[PDB]
Amino acid sequence: NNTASWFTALTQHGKEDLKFPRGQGVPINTNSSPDDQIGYYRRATRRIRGGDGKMKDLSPRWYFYYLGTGPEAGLPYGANKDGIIWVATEGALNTPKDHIGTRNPANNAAIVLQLPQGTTLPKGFYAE
Protein backbone atom coordinates (compact mmCIF):
# COMPACT_ATOMS: atom_id res chain seq x y z
CA ASN A 1 0.00 0.00 0.00
CA ASN A 2 1.07 3.67 -0.36
CA THR A 3 2.61 2.40 -3.66
CA ALA A 4 1.17 3.27 -7.09
CA SER A 5 2.21 3.75 -10.74
CA TRP A 6 3.76 7.14 -11.48
CA PHE A 7 1.22 7.45 -14.38
CA THR A 8 -2.52 7.27 -15.13
CA ALA A 9 -3.77 4.05 -16.81
CA LEU A 10 -4.52 2.74 -20.30
CA THR A 11 -8.05 1.21 -20.57
CA GLN A 12 -8.55 -2.06 -22.62
CA HIS A 13 -11.87 -2.19 -24.60
CA GLY A 14 -10.97 -5.26 -26.76
CA LYS A 15 -10.13 -8.92 -25.94
CA GLU A 16 -6.36 -8.84 -26.75
CA ASP A 17 -3.69 -8.11 -24.06
CA LEU A 18 -1.80 -4.77 -24.38
CA LYS A 19 1.23 -4.94 -26.76
CA PHE A 20 3.57 -2.25 -28.18
CA PRO A 21 5.99 -2.56 -31.16
CA ARG A 22 9.61 -2.76 -29.86
CA GLY A 23 10.97 0.77 -29.12
CA GLN A 24 7.46 2.12 -28.15
CA GLY A 25 5.23 2.29 -25.05
CA VAL A 26 7.28 4.14 -22.35
CA PRO A 27 5.31 7.11 -20.94
CA ILE A 28 6.97 10.58 -21.01
CA ASN A 29 8.57 11.75 -17.74
CA THR A 30 10.80 14.89 -17.90
CA ASN A 31 12.34 13.98 -14.44
CA SER A 32 13.84 10.78 -15.98
CA SER A 33 16.83 10.24 -18.33
CA PRO A 34 17.26 8.21 -21.55
CA ASP A 35 18.85 5.27 -19.62
CA ASP A 36 15.63 5.02 -17.47
CA GLN A 37 13.13 4.47 -20.38
CA ILE A 38 12.17 0.77 -19.76
CA GLY A 39 9.56 -1.19 -17.76
CA TYR A 40 6.24 -3.01 -17.85
CA TYR A 41 2.47 -2.49 -17.83
CA ARG A 42 0.52 -4.57 -15.36
CA ARG A 43 -3.21 -5.36 -15.83
CA ALA A 44 -5.60 -4.36 -13.02
CA THR A 45 -9.06 -6.03 -13.15
CA ARG A 46 -12.33 -4.54 -11.83
CA ARG A 47 -15.85 -6.04 -11.46
CA ILE A 48 -19.03 -4.76 -9.74
CA ARG A 49 -22.37 -6.37 -8.77
CA GLY A 50 -24.94 -5.64 -11.59
CA GLY A 51 -28.75 -5.09 -11.27
CA ASP A 52 -29.16 -8.87 -11.93
CA GLY A 53 -27.05 -9.86 -8.77
CA LYS A 54 -24.16 -11.17 -10.99
CA MET A 55 -20.58 -9.70 -11.25
CA LYS A 56 -20.01 -7.48 -14.35
CA ASP A 57 -16.38 -7.41 -15.60
CA LEU A 58 -15.35 -3.77 -16.37
CA SER A 59 -12.64 -2.75 -18.90
CA PRO A 60 -9.18 -3.84 -17.69
CA ARG A 61 -6.70 -1.04 -16.93
CA TRP A 62 -2.92 -1.25 -17.51
CA TYR A 63 -0.38 0.73 -15.41
CA PHE A 64 3.30 1.39 -16.25
CA TYR A 65 6.11 0.64 -13.73
CA TYR A 66 9.80 1.29 -14.43
CA LEU A 67 11.97 -1.85 -14.68
CA GLY A 68 12.94 -3.13 -11.17
CA THR A 69 10.01 -1.32 -9.45
CA GLY A 70 6.38 -1.93 -8.59
CA PRO A 71 4.41 -5.14 -7.87
CA GLU A 72 6.75 -7.11 -10.23
CA ALA A 73 10.00 -5.18 -9.28
CA GLY A 74 11.73 -8.67 -9.22
CA LEU A 75 10.80 -9.68 -12.84
CA PRO A 76 13.56 -9.29 -15.44
CA TYR A 77 12.75 -7.59 -18.78
CA GLY A 78 10.98 -10.13 -21.13
CA ALA A 79 9.78 -12.47 -18.37
CA ASN A 80 6.56 -14.22 -19.42
CA LYS A 81 3.67 -13.55 -16.96
CA ASP A 82 -0.08 -13.11 -17.60
CA GLY A 83 -1.04 -9.46 -16.92
CA ILE A 84 2.59 -8.27 -17.54
CA ILE A 85 3.76 -6.81 -20.88
CA TRP A 86 7.22 -5.24 -21.48
CA VAL A 87 8.22 -1.90 -23.15
CA ALA A 88 11.59 -0.20 -23.79
CA THR A 89 12.96 2.76 -25.80
CA GLU A 90 16.06 1.82 -27.92
CA GLY A 91 19.20 2.48 -25.77
CA ALA A 92 17.39 2.27 -22.39
CA LEU A 93 19.71 0.40 -19.88
CA ASN A 94 18.59 -3.05 -18.56
CA THR A 95 19.15 -1.96 -14.90
CA PRO A 96 16.61 -1.52 -12.05
CA LYS A 97 15.16 2.06 -11.65
CA ASP A 98 15.27 2.14 -7.79
CA HIS A 99 16.22 5.88 -7.93
CA ILE A 100 12.74 6.48 -9.57
CA GLY A 101 10.83 3.89 -7.50
CA THR A 102 7.02 4.11 -7.27
CA ARG A 103 4.59 6.94 -6.39
CA ASN A 104 3.16 7.56 -2.90
CA PRO A 105 -0.42 8.96 -3.47
CA ALA A 106 -0.17 10.79 -0.08
CA ASN A 107 2.74 12.86 -1.53
CA ASN A 108 2.15 13.11 -5.35
CA ALA A 109 -0.75 12.83 -7.81
CA ALA A 110 -0.21 10.60 -10.92
CA ILE A 111 1.61 12.04 -13.97
CA VAL A 112 -0.87 12.24 -16.91
CA LEU A 113 0.15 9.34 -19.21
CA GLN A 114 1.46 10.76 -22.54
CA LEU A 115 3.28 8.74 -25.25
CA PRO A 116 5.97 10.33 -27.52
CA GLN A 117 4.80 11.62 -30.96
CA GLY A 118 4.46 8.82 -33.61
CA THR A 119 3.45 6.12 -31.05
CA THR A 120 0.62 3.70 -32.00
CA LEU A 121 -1.72 2.64 -29.16
CA PRO A 122 -3.06 -0.82 -30.08
CA LYS A 123 -6.72 -1.34 -31.10
CA GLY A 124 -9.20 -0.69 -28.26
CA PHE A 125 -6.63 0.92 -25.85
CA TYR A 126 -7.13 4.56 -24.66
CA ALA A 127 -5.36 6.78 -22.08
CA GLU A 128 -8.30 7.88 -19.86
Swiss-Prot record:
It is found in: Virion; Host cytoplasm; Secreted; Host extracellular space. GO terms for biological process: induction of platelet aggregation in another organism; negative regulation of interferon-beta production; positive regulation of NLRP3 inflammasome complex assembly; response to host immune response; viral RNA genome packaging. One of its GO terms (cellular component) is MHC class I protein complex. Residues 2-128 form the CoV N NTD domain. Residues 1-128 are annotated as: RNA-binding. ADP-ribosylated. The ADP-ribosylation is retained in the virion during infection. Phosphorylated on serine residues by host GSK3A and GSK3B. This promotes the solubility of homodimers that would otherwise aggregate. Host phosphatase would dephosphorylate the protein during assembly at M bound membranes. RNA binds at residues 46, 61, 103. GO terms for molecular function: identical protein binding; MHC class I protein binding; molecular condensate scaffold activity; poly(U) RNA binding; protein homodimerization activity; protein sequestering activity; RNA binding; RNA stem-loop binding. Residues 17-37 are annotated as: Disordered. The keyword Lyase does not apply. Its main location: virion. Changing residue 22 to E: No effect on RNA-binding. Belongs to the betacoronavirus nucleocapsid protein family. Packages the positive strand viral genome RNA into a helical ribonucleocapsid (RNP) and plays a fundamental role during virion assembly through its interactions with the viral genome and membrane protein M. Plays an important role in enhancing the efficiency of subgenomic viral RNA transcription as well as viral replication. Attenuates the stress granules formation by reducing host G3BP1 access to host mRNAs under stress conditions. This is Nucleoprotein. It comes from Severe acute respiratory syndrome coronavirus 2 (2019-nCoV). The chain holds residues 47 to 174 of 419 of the full protein.
